[PDB]
Specification:
The structure is cut from a larger assembly and holds one copy of chain A, two copies of chain B and two copies of chain C. Helix content of chain A is 56%, strand content 0%. By secondary structure, chain A is mainly α. The longest helix of chain A has 14 residues, at 19-32. The termini of chain A are far apart. The longest helix of chain B is centred in the first third of the chain and has 16 residues, at 29-44. Chain B is extended and about 90 Å long. By secondary structure, chain B is an alpha/beta fold. Chain B folds into three domains: 1-104 and 227-345, P-loop containing nucleotide triphosphate hydrolases (Rossmann fold, 3-Layer(aba) Sandwich); 105-226, OB fold (Dihydrolipoamide Acetyltransferase, E2P); 346-429, Helicase, Ruva Protein, domain 3 (Orthogonal Bundle). Chain B is built from 15 helices and 17 strands. Chain C folds into two domains: 6-110 and 221-340, P-loop containing nucleotide triphosphate hydrolases (Rossmann fold, 3-Layer(aba) Sandwich), CATH 3.40.50.300; 341-427, Helicase, Ruva Protein, domain 3 (Orthogonal Bundle). Chain C has 14 helices and 15 strands. Chain C has helices spanning 33-48, 66-77, 98-107, 154-163, 222-230, 236-239, 249-264, 284-293, 326-329, 342-355, 362-374, 377-393, 401-410, 414-420, and strands at 55-60, 83-87, 111-116, 120-131, 136-142, 147-152, 169-174, 180-186, 202-203, 216-221, 273-277, 301-306, 310-312, 319-321, 332-337. In chain C, the strands form four sheets. Chain C has a six-stranded mixed sheet with strand order 6-5-4-7-8-9, with helices on one face. In chain C, strands 2-11-12-1-15 form a five-stranded parallel sheet, covered by helices on one side. Chain C has a two-stranded antiparallel sheet with strand order 3-10. Chain C is globular. The two termini of chain C are 46 Å apart. Classes of the chains: A mainly alpha, B alpha/beta, C alpha/beta. The interface between B and C is large, with 69 and 80 residues. The structure holds adenosine-5'-diphosphate (ADP) (4 copies). One adenosine-5'-diphosphate binds next to strand 2, helix 2, helix 9 and helix 11 of chain D. The site of one adenosine-5'-diphosphate has 19 residues of chain D, from strand 2, helix 2, helix 9 and helix 11. Chain C: This is RuvB-like 2. Chain C: It is found in: Nucleus matrix; Nucleus, Nucleoplasm; Cytoplasm; Membrane. Chain C: Its main location: nucleus. Chain C: It is an enzyme of class 3 (hydrolase).
Chain lengths: 48, 435, 427, 411, 418
């Protein structure tokens, strides 16, 4: 969550003011606030 | 965590010049700005077989710079630390150990797609046919998204039988490797009994069959070992457990052949990328003349990575020869294929700052008077001893109840623990009493 | 029960106070205040355990209590903290390299403790009904506070029948894995003896709640972890010491996974101590590897005993103090043990003869201290047991001076043996 | 982008720069000067290509670092592929799974190739449809020019059912064995005939033949499981059977090359074994290099030239190399810079040549890349004399580091 | 095909009276040595002696090894000739004592008359008659054959998975059915001959193959199948109860008149490389009654024996072994003998050389060594063929002598110490 809010890319996408960008970023933040395994699930490891 | 927890980089400016005190290092400006050239050469991914020799007396920060090079390179490249004594293996050839170390010192990042079948199994019917062995197996995998009947192999059916699965439980299947795990019986059956010797796991979500991509990283030595001591499956190759089971004593015919061929095939098709790393060989002075001589071809090979040896001796007899001596305990044949880097001996001022950094890294609140007394302690003794004295002083301060280290604490610690030279003098005084 | 009293069985720990102030003759140890205080400081740093790879070198004369201080530290450190004692000559193996044996010795004194909250069910079975048509049944579990009934499933009945648990039996059921463990037979477990029964060992029924949540702990050393992960033969820790784990991902993966476990709070660390007795046996290769093996973050603390002085290093012709190269000697903190005085030798002999349960007279103590000051304290100590046997043979009560003198005339020390070696004696 | 093989100490060597009459050019194919040794190596390369003579050994000696290994790599690159060139360091024979003599004879046998030729009908086309009747079945193969049906046997239909039965797979059918290999989802489809008769040529070495015919699952040549091959039946019978393949139209032997680098590591035992291994008709040609002068042979206190015994030195020819001059050193440095992506000025080349003639040649070759990376730091384009001096100051060499030892270290 | 170092040696050039010709059979000079070699080769043909060793002693470059190869060639191929370098004894898989014993028992040959027979052809029908026998139909280009095979061979047939149409070999002596493949008419061509192949195998075998065959069991159907893997390492065959039984059975067969013993010849090179323990075990073992005749070769004079480092002996061989060993001395060659050897090597390798070139080549040989003058042959012809000239003139050898230094000029240059 910290790194997603930190990167200037998302900051500018928010400053844009467009409805989709703002609502999408808010949805992503809400999802990260929900046990982010949905936002970044733990991948199962297996030998190559 | 001590003895390497304070160094986290070379502390070089944007122009590659050594900064006075930064990144946990002080002094050694020449050595650090030179190792900057080495880290740049390693990050260039353009050369092969280059070798450096960090030469200096004990405790002059050669190993510190060796680890700072790795910290600067990051965790993306393989940094292989090795001691010269590791070549004396009892299962594989002495040169085999060194060549496999060189091979694992090279990296390879590869992006691979793999498929997976998962879902609450509804039924498992083995389709029989006369050969009179089982022909196929139809498994009905249910998921919260959908459901699919899939035909799998008799090997997968046998793996399920080993797992001791039953209809209605949850299993994780993979077609690339062929391994199948039993995640437990579906949560919907947990109400069947009051207690059972069964692990319960809810209905798997998503599609029954799903392909996912993973960007893994493995060294060339990993592929070498995977092809030399294969495990695979679908066979009874498990006899590996008793066939020979030493270190496989690899062979050049396949080390330089099939493996290089297949990895180049993977690279030139956009699937893999070569990631050359670093091979730091600390304590190179106890390597045999045979290892020193093989190092000639190792460094003159077009695939060897950047190597970094550490020299601590001035001039002694070479190991394995017993009659000849050379500088750094390395023969002039190999010493001509390296770029030597001095490690200056530290002065009182630099040693004081090093002690301060070590104390502030070990979570120690040492007073200025104690710090300055450690200056004299270090000018009379070794830097390593003066810095080792830190933690016992902190324990003694905690015992006495003071929140800081004073003169008396370090004095007590120094009086309790002697140094190398003091112990040598005591032994010389008690010569004919220590046996 | 029967584990005899060895040479170091008299010390139960360092005789130190809360402020690490060594007492004269407390907790088995006698004299040697400076070295005991150093041992206590290093032991406190150990019990703290936030610094890894620290080396100490206990040097001193032969028979001045170096191994004694080591065993005292071991005892004061007690269990729940790895302490591995190894002689310098034990690493010279034929199937594994010296460096590999040293890595094993280090990783064997690093403990990983996984703490789990698996819930179970503890009670005294009252009835186990089961009907085969898949068979289905019920169980009645009783504790001193309550009784309850459970419907048994297929695998539950299977495991119960395999373990052959019956009524009156006190058992524990791991609900997560279904593992059954019968702890004993309750007074009800009486089988109404009318047949071939030969067991009547009863025990009180379990108290408290029926379905309680207790805490388990699994403590295994990094050595065991890498050994069981090396190859499918996950029994080399007991099967045999056949080893040689490659330094490839196996050990690096153990380290990386233990790091993630420590970070996520699964099992963090418990450092340990490695007592290398007679370290002068190690080779130049061993010392050169240790030089950098002490620099690893997973390196436990080590204490090396030393009798040698200015002597050649094994495997070469380099004269160095302690028989160790200055390269490694620089990392160490050296503690020197001093020789015991008259009153220290006498007190050591007294404690030893009181530990081995032998009453000596006041003149016996004097003559034994004389013998132990003229000759080795070890010889003086060994004289006690020999002198007690002549007393028991003549049906005495406490060892006198005549028995000690008879034993001295009967057995010879090294000096008198050498002075008696006046003939060729097949040199 | 970056392949396994990268720029190395001998990557510039593309082969021997000789003419049609074995006359070396001043600087050609990455080899500079060393005319005598290069034309002496061309002769052995030519009689190696000939192969009528067996058991020849040519030793090269001189000052350390005088292209001794460069000449061998050039010989290898000129011989090219299809002709085994086994290069091994003098230590590679010291092994725990095999004796030194066994490793040396293993290398000798690896340095001998056997040529064999055969014909095989191979198929390559896109699968269209498959049918199986539980067993026999049918298949439909396609190429960009034609299609066809096949009635497949049990094993073939099973091997095809193992894969995705529906169309898409472009497989190959070796009619001899029938091993299937799907190239991908139809990678494009093949052109021309579906089934074609292809010629297969193999250069299999005697060591590979031994490993194959020595044991069930004999192909242990991928992990060196060939511990002490039984000369009693394996090697003698293999020699006889190779001699029988010969002079019958089945196979022909291709003698390889064995480059033993730093042979002074070998012991009196290895030399005594070579004394007779170089006398067998199946003995390959070999070259050897040495940097030591008259030194002790490993094993005893005998002081012999090149560390090689006299009874073996009499069994080989010797070629001396002359020290490089300013011209040769500068040209070698220029060739190294051309092989690399670095470019230096004329004054920079002069200073680097002086620095590589004061101490040694390899030092300048190594400082090349360091000076390039240091000039790339100050945001320049060409390596300048100031950058070369910065590098000469940063990185030390053998002779300037052995003299800085005015402070005593461990010993 | 390809020339070797001793390929020009056809045999000992001795006349009917035993005297050695000045130049014959590829060998020149060394008359006394060649006559002694013939005297000792007569012992090999007599075959009534055992435990005899003959040591060819001489400086390097002498024809000791050439004389050994000549002995081997004159003996031929019926009697075995086992060469072994003294360095080869230092094995790591098996002890030196047992390596030496294996070589000693492998030198000994054994000729036997094997009267085998194998039926070959395409199957036309298989009918097993809980089986008393199996009737099989075989086809070749000489007619069809109906065969009755023991039910134990029906198991081998089923395991080989043979059926109507496949070509098979079935050995009457052992039942080793081998499925060559399927007939070409449906692959291998149809055999064209008498389906009943009957012929005598007079192939020879060594006495060590018998021990190798009994060292490990060959079979399966049990856990024994696991034995086929596991490196198949060669290990010591116990002298107590294996080679003794081998000798007993071989003697039984020789008495019955099936086997025939042909004692071979051993050839040890660079004997000075053997340890003193190998030397003493050798002088102990060669006293046995079953030991073959051995030819030692020495390349150095008085030196120190390996393993002692305090005892010197002539030829690096201890006196204990040097006694009971006949010593044949090989001396240096003269200029004329060197010229003759060079001419023989040239005309054997296929190079024609002028007289003035051969003269200076013999001069170079007398100056540096015969082996060096010999090695200088090929490159001269190569330069000649490159320049167009098919023969070797004096301008080629004297120019290749400047390209290829010798072991003396090389040392003279190395004298610089760098
Ligand atoms: N430049 C430096 N800054 C801070 N500490 C240093 C520096 N150089 C050395 N040290 C300290 O000295 C100790 C030993 O140095 P080390 O790197 O082991 O020298 P060497 O590699 O020559 O043995 C390290 O624990 C480190 O804390
Ligand atoms: N301070 C002490 N208190 C009690 N016993 C001691 C003390 N010091 C030494 N000893 C006894 O002396 C005996 C031998 O001495 P030891 O501790 O082995 O010294 P070292 O290791 O130098 O030989 C031991 O059995 C030990 O019990
Ligand atoms: N004649 C030459 N032409 C081109 N490059 C050369 C020549 N001679 C030497 N070199 C280069 O200079 C370096 C000399 O080292 P090298 O001759 O390989 O040392 P050694 O052979 O003693 O191991 C090599 O990297 C080689 O590539
Ligand atoms: N009597 C001879 N006649 C012809 N050629 C000979 C004779 N003796 C030796 N030679 C040649 O001289 C060379 C000497 O080789 P070899 O016999 O191995 O010498 P050594 O006596 O040192 O073993 C051989 O190539 C051989 O062909």
């Amino acid at each position: 969550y910290d790194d997603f809010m930190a990167q200037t890319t998302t900051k500018e996408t928010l400053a844009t003011g467009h409805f989709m960008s703002v609502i999408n970023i808010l949805m992503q933040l809400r999802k990260v606030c929900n046990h982010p395994n949905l936002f970044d699930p733990r991948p199962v490891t297996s030998p190559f | 965590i001590a003895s390497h927890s304070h160094v986290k980089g070379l502390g070089l400016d944007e122009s590659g010049l050594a900064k006075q005190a930064a990144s946990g290092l002080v002094g050694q400006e020449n050595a650090r700005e030179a190792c900057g050239v080495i880290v740049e050469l390693i990050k260039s991914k353009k050369m092969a077989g280059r070798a450096v020799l960090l030469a200096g007396p004990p405790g002059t920060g050669k190993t510190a710079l060796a680890l700072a090079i790795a910290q600067e390179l990051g965790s993306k490249v393989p940094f292989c630390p090795m001691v010269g004594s590791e070549v004396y293996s009892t299962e594989i050839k002495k040169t085999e150990v060194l060549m496999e170390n060189f091979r694992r010192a090279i990296g390879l990042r590869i992006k691979e797609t793999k498929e997976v079948y998962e879902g609450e199994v509804t039924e498992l019917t083995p389709c029989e046919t006369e050969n009179k062995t089982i022909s196929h197996v139809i498994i009905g995998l249910k998921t919260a998204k959908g459901t699919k009947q899939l035909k799998l192999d008799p090997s997968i059916f046998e793996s399920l039988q080993k797992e001791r699965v039953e209809a209605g439980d949850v299993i994780y299947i993979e077609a690339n490797s062929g391994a199948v795990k039993r995640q437990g019986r579906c949560d919907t059956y947990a109400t069947e009994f009051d207690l059972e010797a069964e692990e319960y796991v809810p209905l798997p979500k998503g599609d029954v069959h799903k392909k996912k991509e993973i960007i893994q990283d493995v060294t060339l030595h990993d592929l070498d070992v995977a092809n030399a001591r294969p495990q695979g499956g679908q066979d009874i190759l498990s006899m590996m457990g008793q066939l020979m089971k030493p270190k496989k004593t690899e062979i050049t015919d396949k080390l330089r052949g099939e493996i290089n061929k297949v990895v180049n095939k993977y690279i030139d098709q956009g699937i893999a990328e070569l990631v050359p790393g670093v091979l730091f060989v600390d304590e190179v002075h106890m390597l045999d003349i045979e290892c020193f001589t093989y190092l000639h071809r190792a460094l003159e090979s077009s695939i060897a990575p950047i190597v970094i040896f550490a020299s601590n001796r001035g001039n002694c007899v070479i190991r394995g020869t017993e009659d000849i001596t050379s500088p750094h305990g390395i023969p002039l044949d190999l010493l001509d294929r390296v770029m030597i880097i001095r490690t200056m001996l530290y002065t009182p001022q630099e040693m004081k700052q090093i002690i301060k950094i070590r104390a502030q890294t070990e979570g120690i609140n040492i007073s200025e008077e104690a710090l300055n007394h450690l200056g004299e302690i270090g000018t009379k003794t070794t830097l390593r001893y003066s810095v080792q004295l830190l933690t016992p002083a902190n324990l003694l301060a905690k015992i006495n109840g003071k929140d800081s280290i004073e003169k008396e604490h370090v004095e007590e610690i120094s009086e309790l623990f002697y140094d190398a030279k003091s112990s040598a003098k005591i032994l010389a005084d008690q010569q004919d009493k220590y046996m | 029960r029967i584990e005899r009293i060895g040479a170091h069985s008299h010390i139960r720990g360092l005789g130190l106070d809360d402020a690490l102030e060594p007492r004269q003759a407390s907790q088995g140890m006698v004299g040697q205040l400076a070295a005991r205080r150093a041992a206590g400081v290093v032991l406190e740093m150990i019990r703290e355990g936030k610094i890894a790879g620290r080396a100490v070198l206990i040097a001193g004369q032969p028979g001045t209590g170096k191994t004694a201080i080591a065993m005292g530290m071991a005892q004061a450190l007690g269990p729940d903290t790895p302490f591995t004692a190894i002689a310098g000559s034990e690493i010279f193996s034929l199937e594994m390299s010296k460096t590999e044996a040293l890595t094993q010795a280090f990783r064997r004194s690093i403990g990983v403790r996984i703490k789990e909250e698996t819930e179970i069910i503890e009670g005294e079975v009252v009835e186990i009904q089961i009907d085969r048509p898949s068979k289905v049944g019920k169980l009645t579990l009783k504790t001193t506070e309550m009784e309850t009934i459970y419907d048994l499933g297929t695998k539950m009945i299977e495991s119960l029948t395999k373990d052959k648990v019956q009524a009156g039996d006190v058992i524990t059921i791991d609900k997560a894995t279904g593992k059954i463990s019968k702890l004993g037979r309750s007074f009800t477990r009486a089988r109404d003896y009318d047949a071939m029964g030969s067991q009547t060992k009863f025990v009180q029924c379990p108290d408290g709640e029926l379905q309680k949540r207790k805490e388990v702990v699994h403590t295994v050393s990094l050595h065991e972890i890498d050994v069981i992960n090396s190859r499918t033969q996950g029994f080399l820790a007991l099967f045999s010491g056949d080893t040689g784990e490659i330094k490839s991902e196996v050990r690096e993966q153990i380290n990386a996974k233990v790091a993630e476990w420590r970070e996520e709070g699964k099992a963090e660390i418990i450092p340990g101590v490695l007592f290398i007795d007679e370290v002068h046996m190690l080779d130049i290769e061993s010392f050169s590897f240790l030089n950098r093996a002490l620099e690893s973050d997973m390196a436990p603390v080590l204490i090396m005993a030393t009798n040698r002085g200015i002597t050649r290093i094994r495997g070469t012709s380099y004269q160095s103090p302690h028989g160790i190269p200055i390269d490694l000697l620089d990392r160490l903190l050296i503690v020197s043990t001093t020789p015991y005085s008259e009153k220290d030798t006498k007190q050591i002999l007294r404690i030893r003869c009181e530990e081995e349960d032998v009453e000596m007279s006041e003149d016996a103590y004097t003559v034994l201290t004389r013998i132990g000051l003229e000759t080795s304290l070890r010889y003086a100590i060994q004289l006690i047991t020999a002198a007690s046997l002549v007393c028991r043979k003549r049906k005495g009560t406490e060892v006198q001076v005549d028995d000690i003198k008879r034993v001295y005339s009967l057995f010879l020390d090294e000096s008198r043996s050498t002075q008696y070696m006046k003939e060729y004696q097949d040199a």
